[PDB]
Design a protein around this ligand. Structure first.
Ligand SMILES: *[C@@H]1O[C@H](CO)[C@@H](O[C@@H]2O[C@H](CO)[C@@H](O[C@@H]3O[C@H](CO)[C@@H](O)[C@H](O)[C@@H]3O)[C@H](O)[C@H]2NC(C)=O)[C@H](O)[C@H]1NC(C)=O
Ligand SMILES: *[C@@H]1O[C@H](CO)[C@@H](O[C@@H]2O[C@H](CO)[C@@H](O)[C@H](O)[C@H]2NC(C)=O)[C@H](O)[C@H]1NC(C)=O
Ligand SMILES: *[C@@H]1O[C@H](CO)[C@@H](O[C@@H]2O[C@H](CO)[C@@H](O)[C@H](O)[C@H]2NC(C)=O)[C@H](O)[C@H]1NC(C)=O
Ligand SMILES: *[C@@H]1O[C@H](CO)[C@@H](O[C@@H]2O[C@H](CO)[C@@H](O)[C@H](O)[C@H]2NC(C)=O)[C@H](O)[C@H]1NC(C)=O
Ligand SMILES: *[C@@H]1O[C@H](CO)[C@@H](O[C@@H]2O[C@H](CO)[C@@H](O)[C@H](O)[C@H]2NC(C)=O)[C@H](O)[C@H]1NC(C)=O
Ligand SMILES: *[C@@H]1O[C@H](CO)[C@@H](O[C@@H]2O[C@H](CO)[C@@H](O)[C@H](O)[C@H]2NC(C)=O)[C@H](O)[C@H]1NC(C)=O
Ligand SMILES: *[C@@H]1O[C@H](CO)[C@@H](O[C@@H]2O[C@H](CO)[C@@H](O)[C@H](O)[C@H]2NC(C)=O)[C@H](O)[C@H]1NC(C)=O
Ligand SMILES: *[C@@H]1O[C@H](CO)[C@@H](O)[C@H](O)[C@H]1NC(C)=O
Ligand SMILES: *[C@@H]1O[C@H](CO)[C@@H](O)[C@H](O)[C@H]1NC(C)=O
Ligand SMILES: *[C@@H]1O[C@H](CO)[C@@H](O)[C@H](O)[C@H]1NC(C)=O
Ligand SMILES: *[C@@H]1O[C@H](CO)[C@@H](O)[C@H](O)[C@H]1NC(C)=O
Ligand SMILES: *[C@@H]1O[C@H](CO)[C@@H](O)[C@H](O)[C@H]1NC(C)=O
Ligand SMILES: *[C@@H]1O[C@H](CO)[C@@H](O)[C@H](O)[C@H]1NC(C)=O
Ligand SMILES: *[C@@H]1O[C@H](CO)[C@@H](O)[C@H](O)[C@H]1NC(C)=O
Ligand SMILES: *[C@@H]1O[C@H](CO)[C@@H](O)[C@H](O)[C@H]1NC(C)=O
Ligand SMILES: *[C@@H]1O[C@H](CO)[C@@H](O)[C@H](O)[C@H]1NC(C)=O
Lengths: 426, 95, 120, 118, 117, 116
């Protein structure tokens, strides 16, 4: 008949764009984030085809977190007079974990030098009784700049004008596929940028039950993501009572060493409840049996091997970096009181899987304690198989971020349409 | 589970004829031709697409759960052992 | 893209053998490395992969507790060395060992190693 | 609200165009880029709207004849049963030539006629 | 000149709209000017869109349908009061009108023509 | 036949290809250099559109005005090009713009307002 033009029709297309930060003295620079009740609109009669393994939000979040990490280490002290020949002895005469290492150092005047000491961990020094820092042959050290805090705070990811973020409200939702309950939103909820390898902490819980999501479960080279419907409380502690001592290494440059420890030297550790973990493992086995035979045997085991970052549950509690031995949890074999996990502490950190640059971490005085809620798991399956066995695994932060952005997606609005109508222009 | 078989066993194709090696499997399948006392080489990947650097005569086709590779204008140098691997499961192959 | 291999090794029963590959020609950290072994007059047998970025291996139930996979990068991350250790040589461990590069999710190994003869 | 009538049919989604029409307008460059991109996209859409003689109107009628080759369905069904998203894919192939026809046939010749007869 | 009719009455200040209308568009120092340019463009575009949705495109004086808070007489309003006093007085009642024009009054009128033709 | 393809053609023949010229107006090192161009093009386009809007000719490629004027139209539209026209008449364009701004548009608004 005739063609007519409509401006402002509801139509969207898949696209990728830069999303900015809205968030209600911090590493993630939330002061630059714009201030953020947000409205959410329900869409009926609609089924959007979602995919969580190929969305661009995770890549942009990864590069933005890396950029925020990098730009917050520029102003603060560059510790590269500390690559000298240390002389270390035992702290007491658990044994051999701490060392008293003395060395020479520079001072405010170029022609003068001083002799100082500090308490180092066994994981930060390498023997040449003369030791040296672990990474003076591979990278340079910059201090962690005590004026900032490492505590994560929620961050939103909001879209520009002309774009929208679709959400899936299906409770029992698989990683990929249609969502019969799509809604729209300007931007997401608060996401805490927490770093961990084997257990997910301070995350978002499932609504209905435990969910299993992997890109292709038949391929053993891809990890399995497990989400709990109820959290598992875990208490981590650092019994030692440290004292921090400040050392001047130049004009306006300060190095924060460790004076000593008051009282007794005790091992840092984390506690989990046995019965709740047993129930959680039973639920996980019941859900895992759906992707295999109904009579197959399930097993769990210690990590196979690798670096210290992937073989141990790694995180930070209040500014100290914990690596915890988790081989007491995955100890089971399923056929159809508390648990204490010894931990170790490290200060020289190679973060984001980069081998070029490293970071220090000043000692924090007082006793440190954390209470956190385990929400998820990352697993791998041994190939060559009944009797499927699963090991803990991790090391890639995109798996950490993907467990939060599995329901969101970004779309672009196209407000032009042409339609047949009987009207004729004058 | 993954079940995959390669029935033809040994063949007796002659020079200048067309040969076909068939197999059945589920999942991604790849064809390798190994000469005696040498490392394997990839001919066709995903069971339909041929890697760059192999002559265009080698062609493999998939239908349902049955795959097979056909070679036409056979040359004397093509007397090797041909086998198909899904993910981590391999069969002895055909010679 | 070129890999390398070590010479043939002869070891007594109840000993340990070490086989090394070396990949110099490409971005090593972005592709897995797989190991295979072939018995005389038999098809290929799967040995597990190793992730170059983190080093975590994955071995089947047959080789659990007997095989170790490690990698050691060098300065500037230009070359890599991938090792394979076998703990207790048995009567029927004789085979030829290859190292392969998985290009993508299809599990298609375009580049293979020269091979090593292991005899007890 | 925004995109509220996404699931509704074409007939009931034509009364809510204003809702979408008035919502079209490190951490320092990611805001400036978005702010300029929105303006560029809005100006491009408005330019294409204007050069067809439809500037300032949400629903404009055009004197470009519509043949059955591009698409053919009953007018009762199109506006009563199917959705805008469903229609977008069906006619997506022939949009460019329709825009080309709207370019000069709708307005340019009529512009010359108005110039002569004024 | 620019803003010169400020003290004049709304009757005599409505004849110079154009002179105020022109001036809407018109490394530390290299970043404080691009921000100003983008901000000016954005504000002008938002005002233009607001005018256009109500049915007023390229018109400095419009007439619209909604009836008409105030109790003053027309002569009183346009005889002695200035624009700024009116703006300060009636800042509360603007939001009612803004959504009233765009939502229904124009949106209805955009349909009957389509129905008529 | 294309962008600026009637540059040498006579004004009468050039006036038929308005749309091809009108369409192309809108659309680290070389990271800010592209942004500068992106802002500049939008600014220029908006300025030209504002000038058209003030005169009452918004959204019109061939507008008619109410401002009256040798130079018979027969020689102008048949024997000259737009470039020579520009070189000859660029002197008076400011006074023509000034007349167009308020002599014929704001007045028309006054009569339209007072009529209803
Ligand atoms: C997961 O979230 C919980 C939220 O409770 C985190 O626990 C909290 O950790 C912070 C950081 O140490 C604690 O703040 C500290 O409190 C002490 C005592 O008031 C104060 O002296 C310090 O200056 C600091 O403000 C906070 O108390 C603690 N919350 C609880 C209930 O204990 C936990 O760290 C998070 N886990 C991870 C891995 O991020
Ligand atoms: C760690 O040691 C410090 C001493 O350096 C303790 O600090 C004292 O705490 C008590 C308890 O409130 C106060 O009354 C004192 O004034 C504190 N300062 C002193 C004694 O100089 C601290 O309590 C110790 N930590 C723990 C967990 O006991
Ligand atoms: C974590 O679990 C350990 C082990 O049960 C707790 O350590 C016990 O603490 C009580 C109170 O001081 C002692 O009487 C027990 O002897 C300790 N257990 C052992 C094995 O020595 C610890 O209190 C728990 N909570 C934490 C660390 O916050
Ligand atoms: C981990 O720490 C939490 C918090 O200190 C412990 O929760 C306490 O549980 C007891 C009973 O078991 C309650 O009487 C306390 O009131 C709880 N604390 C608070 C602050 O409410 C928990 O028991 C600890 N151990 C775990 C979770 O294994
Ligand atoms: C896997 O479990 C084994 C044992 O349960 C752990 O291996 C032990 O490692 C210590 C470290 O020196 C050795 O002294 C023991 O002899 C080992 N056990 C055996 C049985 O040989 C191993 O730590 C666990 N995996 C991880 C990643 O921790
Ligand atoms: C992680 O924890 C496990 C369990 O405690 C450790 O395995 C024990 O290691 C000691 C080390 O000599 C052995 O004596 C024990 O026999 C091992 N336990 C079992 C059940 O075999 C393991 O060593 C820890 N990992 C590390 C790196 O210390
Ligand atoms: C894992 O990968 C395999 C192989 O790429 C997928 O197998 C395909 O499955 C679809 C639907 O079942 C079939 O139409 C294809 O013919 C299969 N491809 C083959 C046999 O080569 C499998 O679907 C993937 N797993 C998931 C969960 O997507
Ligand atoms: C589409 O949504 C509307 C609004 O809720 C509803 O009335 C209608 O029944 C829906 N369509 C179908 C086919 O259910
Ligand atoms: C110090 O620690 C080392 C390492 O455990 C130990 O061998 C030595 O006996 C200790 N005592 C000394 C060196 O006096
Ligand atoms: C510090 O330097 C002096 C140089 O006189 C040297 O004798 C001493 O051993 C050094 N101290 C340490 C801990 O290396
Ligand atoms: C978990 O609990 C069940 C039932 O109480 C028990 O049969 C099972 O042995 C427990 N698991 C472990 C590892 O003890
Ligand atoms: C569990 O761990 C303990 C010690 O960590 C070990 O002795 C035991 O063999 C493991 N397996 C069980 C109890 O099935
Ligand atoms: C688990 O801990 C987090 C943070 O400490 C808290 O927000 C959450 O409410 C806790 N879980 C439950 C069930 O309360
Ligand atoms: C071999 O070729 C086809 C593929 O073209 C394969 O599907 C089928 O199994 C075989 N066909 C015959 C005729 O053997
Ligand atoms: C640095 O020294 C350590 C300790 O000997 C060594 O393991 C590491 O390989 C060295 N770095 C490089 C790049 O070789
Ligand atoms: C200022 O007010 C006086 C008093 O009515 C008036 O005569 C004069 O014109 C006003 N000035 C302007 C610029 O409007």
């Amino acid at each position: 008949l005739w063609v007519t033009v409509y401006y402002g029709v509801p139509v969207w297309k898949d696209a990728e764009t830069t999303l900015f930060c809205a968030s209600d003295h911090n590493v993630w620079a939330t002061h630059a984030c714009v201030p953020t009740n947000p409205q959410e609109i329900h869409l009926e009669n609609v089924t959007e085809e979602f995919n969580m393994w190929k969305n661009n939000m995770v890549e942009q979040m990864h590069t933005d977190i890396i950029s925020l990490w990098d730009q917050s280490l520029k102003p603060c002290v560059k510790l590269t007079p500390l690559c000298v020949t240390l002389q270390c002895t035992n702290v007491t005469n658990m044994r051999g974990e701490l060392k008293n290492c003395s060395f020479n150092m520079t001072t405010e005047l170029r022609d003068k030098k001083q002799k100082v000491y500090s308490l180092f961990y066994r994981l930060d020094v390498v023997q040449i009784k003369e030791y040296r820092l672990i990474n003076c042959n591979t990278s340079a050290i910059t201090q962690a700049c005590p004026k900032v805090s490492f505590e994560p705070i929620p961050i939103h990811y909001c879209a520009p004008a002309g774009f929208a973020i679709l959400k899936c409200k299906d409770k029992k939702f698989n990683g990929t596929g249609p969502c019969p309950s799509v809604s729209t939103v300007q931007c997401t909820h608060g996401i805490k940028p927490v770093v961990s390898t084997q257990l997910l902490l301070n995350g978002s819980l499932a609504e209905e039950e435990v969910m299993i999501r992997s890109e292709n479960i038949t391929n053993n080279a891809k990890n399995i993501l497990v989400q709990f419907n109820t959290p598992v409380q875990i208490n981590c502690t650092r019994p030692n009572n440290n004292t921090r001592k400040s050392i001047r290494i130049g004009p306006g440059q300060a190095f924060y060493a460790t004076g000593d420890i008051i009282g007794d030297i005790r091992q840092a550790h984390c506690n989990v409840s046995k019965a709740t973990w047993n129930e959680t493992l039973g639920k996980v086995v019941k859900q895992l049996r759906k992707h295999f035979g109904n009579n197959t045997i399930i097993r769990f085991a210690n990590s196979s091997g690798g670096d210290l970052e992937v073989t141990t549950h790694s995180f930070n509690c209040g500014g100290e970096f914990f690596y915890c031995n988790t081989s007491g949890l995955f100890n089971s074999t399923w056929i159809s009181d508390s648990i204490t996990l010894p931990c170790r502490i490290k200060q020289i950190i190679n973060m984001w899987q980069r081998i070029g640059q490293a970071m220090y971490a000043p000692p924090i005085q007082g006793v440190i304690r954390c209470v956190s809620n385990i929400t998820g798991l990352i697993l791998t399956r041994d190939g060559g198989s009944t009797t499927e066995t699963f090991r803990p695994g991790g090391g890639d932060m995109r798996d950490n971020w993907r467990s939060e952005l599995y329901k969101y997606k970004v779309v672009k609005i196209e407000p032009l349409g042409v339609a047949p109508t009987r009207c004729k222009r004058r | 589970d993954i079940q995959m078989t390669q029935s033809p066993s040994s063949l007796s194709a002659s020079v200048g004829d067309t040969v076909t090696i068939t197999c059945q499997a589920n999942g991604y399948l790849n064809w390798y031709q190994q000469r005696r006392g040498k490392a394997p080489k990839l001919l066709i990947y995903d069971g339909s697409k041929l890697e760059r650097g192999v002559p265009s005569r080698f062609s493999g086709r998939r239908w349902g759960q049955e795959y097979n590779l056909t070679i036409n204008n056979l040359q004397p140098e093509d007397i090797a052992t041909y086998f198909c691997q899904v993910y981590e499961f391999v069969v002895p192959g055909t010679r | 893209v070129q890999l390398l291999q070590s010479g043939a090794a002869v070891t007594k029963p109840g000993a340990s053998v070490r086989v090394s590959c070396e990949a110099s020609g490409y971005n090593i950290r972005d592709y897995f490395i797989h190991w295979w072994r072939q018995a005389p007059g038999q098809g290929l047998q799967w040995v597990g992969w190793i992730n170059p970025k983190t080093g975590q291996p994955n071995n089947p139930r047959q080789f659990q507790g007997r095989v170790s996979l490690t990698r050691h990068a060098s300065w500037d991350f230009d070359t890599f060395s991938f090792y394979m250790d076998l703990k207790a040589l048995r009567s029927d461990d004789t085979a030829v060992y290859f190292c392969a590069r998985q290009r993508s999710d299809y599990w298609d190994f375009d580049v293979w190693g020269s091979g090593t003869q292991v005899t007890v | 609200g925004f995109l509220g009538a996404a699931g509704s049919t074409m007939g009931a989604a034509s009364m809510t165009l204003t809702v979408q029409a008035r919502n079209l307008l490190v951490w320092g460059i990611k805001q400036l880029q978005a702010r300029v991109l929105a303006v560029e996209r809005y100006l491009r859409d408005q330019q294409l709207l204007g050069i067809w003689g439809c500037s300032g109107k949400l629903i404009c009628c055009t004197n470009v004849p519509w043949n059955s080759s591009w698409s053919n369905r009953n007018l009762s069904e199109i506006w009563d049963n199917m959705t805008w998203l469903q229609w977008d894919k069906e006619i997506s192939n022939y949009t460019q030539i329709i825009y080309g026809l709207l370019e000069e046939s709708q307005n340019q010749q009529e512009k010359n006629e108005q110039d002569l007869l004024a």
